[PDB]
Design a protein around this ligand. Structure first.
Ligand SMILES: O=C(/C=C/c1ccc(C(F)(F)F)cc1)NCC(=O)N1CCNC(=O)C1
Ligand SMILES: *[C@@H]1O[C@H](CO)[C@@H](O)[C@H](O)[C@H]1NC(C)=O
Lengths: 605, 29
């Protein structure tokens, strides 16, 4: 509908597509088998970003009050983009940068914003992978290192930090992070973290050395292992003592928070992180398929798996959440029993959870003075299930503590960190695709040089940038990417992709194109979502996102041993300078879209 | 260190894989 002259010149002819598959055998990569492409899409739409983020956001809002908005926006904003990206890649036979540049020369900014976004989400997820590897390397020890505390110079006093907190909390914050007390206290590089980061980048390079020539064989183990191990852990999680307690707890959501715009905004932005939309890897990967490949059926199959896996992983987390809360309730309970048995010297086993409050009174009446000094605890289990976990605690605090309480704890630790490592890797193949393909399409390195050279330099460059997260104050920096700074760009790119395919390229041409590729015009579901539903929803979510999420003062959680109510949470304000960083990390990619477009319409004059 | 020795083994096999893979490409002529 917007005037676009010269489009037919830039893009391949519809008749030329019939004479391209058997004559472009060289120069362009090809999937060996449909299975390789489907396993790549599985690993990028159900890697981390689905399996890592979703469960955290479930327990940070409400077990079931978040899945409802998530599954609504999956259908109405996610499936439509997923199909659109698959189809446009398959049609125009190019990556994100090739695709948007050919639909209109002013939209090369859309492709540069996807490469930067992909860069930034790769930098984030590979730090998470370096932590996962640290924990996998410490998982070959009968007593897992996070099961006990270190002693003092007297070798008779437990470390005060561990004593005040826990063996796990201390292994995370002190033995892994060696965390400082604020983002301003940079400290120095944790050498053992640096070795883990090098390991993460180096394994990624081994798998991505010749793009899909190498990543397509990697996905046979990397997109199949996670799903079997997540099935095993589902069974073990369900067989837990309190497992069902958490399972019932995520399927009884409070509806008072289903009316909270933050639940809608997080679900909004999670749909684009879950599917790896607006990164540009999906467009590149779909561009290597046959022109007669059914991209509609693929988008639907991937989607169904994405939604089903989101709800499945929420069951595996909450079974473990339920297990932790129940072993707390019991513990706390067993100590309230032990206070009056030690105060009134009652026979052990006489006072039980069944007969406790009665005994409290029977004893209070007997000796109220001898009952007053008996400090007790008020611990209902609904207060334990609804105890939110800040940061990466669900992985390195809740799941790690629960694995130590299981028998053969070292075999469950290795399976858990191998599952997460493969998910990380599968996701990292897409994010690397979304940085490598654009740099190939910017012709910045000598064409003569093998891709191996370009892939290697991206791995070294990003490895060196990731030294900031190896600092004493690294987690604090990684938590800035967890801010709205990590999401605004994704919402802007997704909108612009939808808008440009429907109004700059034309939805009518796009329907004739799909009709050519798969044999039928997309039905009225796709039409409504592509022309109104998806676009409007994306705009609204972007508008309200700034109304509250962006407006709210950026705060973060510090781990200070020297703090009153120490093992409890002290959120502070980030310095003024930090906010500038959030602006550049989110603004540059977003502003690349218009910035490049305005550059192109003042070079024309 | 157990973590260190496991790390070393993983690194070794990974770098060996990388070397084999790059050499495999050199072999491809
Ligand atoms: O800690 C987790 C995931 C843990 C986990 C996932 C899956 C499993 C499974 F069940 F699959 F085994 C077990 C643990 N996520 C943190 C997160 O997403 N953020 C981003 C937003 N905010 C933050 O600071 C932290
Ligand atoms: C941790 O950080 C402190 C302060 O930067 C430093 O002195 C110490 O050497 C680091 N290492 C360990 C193992 O804590």
């Amino acid at each position: 509908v917007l005037p676009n002259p010269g489009l037919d010149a830039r893009i391949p002819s519809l008749a030329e597509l019939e004479t391209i598959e058997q004559e472009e055998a060289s120069s362009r990569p090809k999937w060996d088998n449909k299975a390789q492409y489907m396993l790549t899409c599985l690993g990028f739409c159900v890697g981390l970003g689905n399996v890592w983020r979703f469960p955290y956001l479930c327990q940070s809002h409400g077990g079931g009050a978040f899945m409802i908005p998530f599954l609504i926006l999956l259908v109405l904003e996610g499936i439509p983009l997923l199909y659109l990206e698959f189809a446009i890649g398959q049609r125009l036979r190019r990556g994100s940068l090739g695709v948007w540049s050919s639909i209109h020369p002013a939209l090369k900014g859309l492709g540069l914003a996807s490469m930067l976004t992909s860069f930034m989400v790769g930098l984030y997820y590979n730090t998470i992978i370096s932590w996962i590897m640290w924990y996998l390397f410490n998982s070959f020890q009968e007593p897992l290192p996070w099961s006990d505390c270190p002693l003092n110079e007297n070798q008779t006093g437990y470390v005060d930090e561990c004593a005040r907190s826990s063996p796990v909390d201390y292994f995370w914050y002190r033995e892994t992070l060696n965390i400082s007390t604020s983002i301003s206290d940079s400290g120095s590089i944790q050498w053992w973290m640096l070795l883990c980061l090098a390991c993460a980048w180096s394994v990624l390079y081994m798998c991505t050395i010749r793009g899909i020539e190498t990543t397509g064989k990697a996905v046979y183990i990397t997109s199949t292992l996670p799903y079997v191990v997540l099935t095993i852990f589902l069974i073990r999680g369900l067989t837990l003592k309190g497992a069902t307690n958490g399972i019932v707890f995520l399927f009884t959501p409070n509806v008072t928070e289903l009316a909270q715009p933050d639940t809608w905004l997080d679900a909004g932005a999670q749909v684009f992180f879950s599917f790896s939309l607006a990164f540009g890897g999906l467009i590149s990967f779909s561009s290597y398929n046959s022109v007669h490949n059914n991209c509609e059926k693929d988008s639907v199959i991937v989607s169904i798996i994405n939604g089903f896996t989101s709800v499945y992983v929420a069951i595996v987390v909450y079974s473990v959440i339920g297990f932790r809360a129940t072993q707390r309730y019991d513990d706390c309970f067993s100590t309230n029993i032990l206070t009056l048995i030690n105060g009134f010297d009652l026979p052990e086993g006489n006072v039980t959870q069944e007969n406790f409050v009665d005994m409290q009174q029977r004893c209070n009446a007997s000796d109220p003075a001898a009952y007053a000094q008996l400090v007790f605890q008020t611990c209902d289990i609904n207060a334990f299930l609804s105890e939110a976990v800040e940061g990466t605690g669900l992985a390195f605090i809740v799941f790690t503590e629960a694995i130590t309480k299981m028998p053969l704890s070292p075999l469950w630790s290795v399976l858990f960190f191998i599952m997460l490592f493969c998910l990380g890797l599968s996701s990292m193949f897409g994010n690397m695709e979304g940085v490598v393909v654009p740099l190939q399409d910017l012709r910045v390195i000598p064409p003569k040089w093998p891709k191996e050279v370009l892939t290697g330099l991206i791995c070294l460059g990003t490895f060196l940038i990731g030294f900031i997260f190896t600092l004493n104050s690294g987690q604090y920096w990684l938590s800035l990417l967890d801010s709205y700074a990590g999401s605004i760009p994704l919402l802007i790119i997704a909108f612009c992709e939808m808008f440009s395919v429907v109004y700059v390229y034309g939805v009518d041409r796009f329907n004739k194109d799909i009709e050519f590729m798969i044999g039928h015009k997309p039905n009225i579901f796709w039409q409504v979502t592509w022309r109104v539903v998806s676009p409007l929803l994306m705009l609204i979510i972007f508008l309200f996102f700034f109304v509250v999420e962006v407006s709210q003062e950026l705060t973060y959680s510090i781990w200070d041993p020297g703090y009153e109510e120490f093992p409890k949470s002290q959120k502070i304000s980030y310095p003024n300078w930090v906010y500038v960083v959030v602006v550049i990390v989110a603004g540059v990619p977003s502003l690349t879209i218009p910035g490049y477009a305005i550059y192109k319409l003042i070079r024309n004059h | 260190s157990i973590w260190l020795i496991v790390f070393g083994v993983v690194m070794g096999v990974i770098v060996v894989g990388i070397v084999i893979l790059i050499f495999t490409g050199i072999r491809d002529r």
